[PDB]
């Protein structure tokens, strides 16, 4: 009685469907304006529980049961928890960045995030509005393993 078997058995289920979730303080948006950034989530993403506005103690502590390295990024204040795991997190990050940014005074700030398995840095989560299509780590290898003939030209 009463918080444990209910809701708690789904908070780690829809957030464990993979390994690449995030966290954003969403709320400062009217029902109509709020149903746009969330409802549209399917577009920029794919139902990815981009933090259905959990709360606290439940989402943060939840890390224990699952052991997602404890998304120790930001539990204070609003807690949305952008479920980038249940959808297709990667480059869609931008679809949620500009939306909750280019509209109203700071639509919805971000919090934590796990890069496949690592912890997404606060200051290193926004600038990446566009999930590196893997090309990044590939834009300095093949073009950096064949450029001594380009200064070879």
């Amino acid at each position: 009685k009463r918080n444990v078997e209910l809701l708690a058995t789904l908070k780690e289920n829809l957030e464990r469907a993979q390994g690449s979730f995030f966290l954003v303080n969403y709320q400062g948006l009217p029902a109509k304006e709020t149903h746009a950034l969330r409802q549209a989530l399917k577009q920029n993403g794919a139902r990815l529980f981009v933090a259905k506005n959990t709360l606290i103690r439940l989402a943060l502590k939840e890390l224990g049961l699952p052991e997602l390295d404890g998304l120790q990024g930001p539990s204070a204040v609003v807690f949305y928890e952008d479920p980038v795991a249940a959808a297709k997190t990667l480059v869609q990050f931008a679809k949620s960045n500009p939306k909750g940014i280019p509209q109203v005074k700071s639509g919805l700030l971000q919090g934590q995030i796990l890069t496949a398995k690592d912890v997404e840095a606060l200051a290193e989560l926004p600038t990446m509005d566009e999930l590196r299509a893997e090309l990044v780590g590939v834009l300095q290898a093949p073009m950096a393993e064949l450029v001594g003939v380009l200064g070879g030209v």
Binding site: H35, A36, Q39, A40, L41, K42
Partner: protein, 134 residues
Amino acid sequence: VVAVVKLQLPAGKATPAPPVGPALGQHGANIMEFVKAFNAATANMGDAIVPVEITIYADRSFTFVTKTPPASYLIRKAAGLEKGAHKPGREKVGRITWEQVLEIAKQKMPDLNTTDLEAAARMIAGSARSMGVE
């Protein structure tokens, strides 16, 4: 100056009596008798909650274009809800075909919050309930 107001008229008629309307023609708008112009528009839209809905520019004007029927209404619009002819219900002309609800939208499922790939299964269950198709 500038600032308009929201409004929801019908989908078919145009006669502007009390809808087009102490609403627009007051709080902010122009001209009246939006009916004549409503018929030339709502004619192709009006039978499942169609919001546009009612404004007033510097003319004012005008008809043309539209929105469609509200979610539920637009979901079970292919029913008939011919009921209500007395109290809350409740006899004769009730069903609308199990497939109809789906066939009716189907298309009738574009403009909606966030998005929906089905308004005849989950969308119908809701709106339909408001009418009688629970």
